[PDB]
């Protein structure tokens, strides 16, 4: 497909535009943002000081 990228926006295609093909879409939901970050990841290891349970 001929296009003009200078506009800052480019028309999206599938193999269907230039060749004899068919679209091959299949649904999935793991690419939603909320789903993607809704899992735990670590930020580091921490410690407690001696006898902090009963002092300043």
């Amino acid at each position: 497909g001929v296009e003009n990228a200078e506009k800052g926006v480019t028309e999206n295609t599938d193999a269907t535009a230039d060749f004899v093909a068919q679209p091959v879409y299949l649904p999935e939901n793991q690419t939603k943002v909320a789903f993607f970050y809704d899992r735990s990841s670590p930020i580091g290891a921490f410690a407690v000081k001696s006898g902090s349970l009963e002092s300043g």
């Binding site: 497909g1 001929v2 296009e3 003009n4 480019t10 028309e11 295609t13 535009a17 230039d18």
Partner: peptide, 9 residues
């Protein structure tokens, strides 16, 4: 009239 048109200048 008709193609992969109006992406066209």
């Amino acid at each position: 009239a008709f193609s992969n048109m109006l992406p066209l200048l």
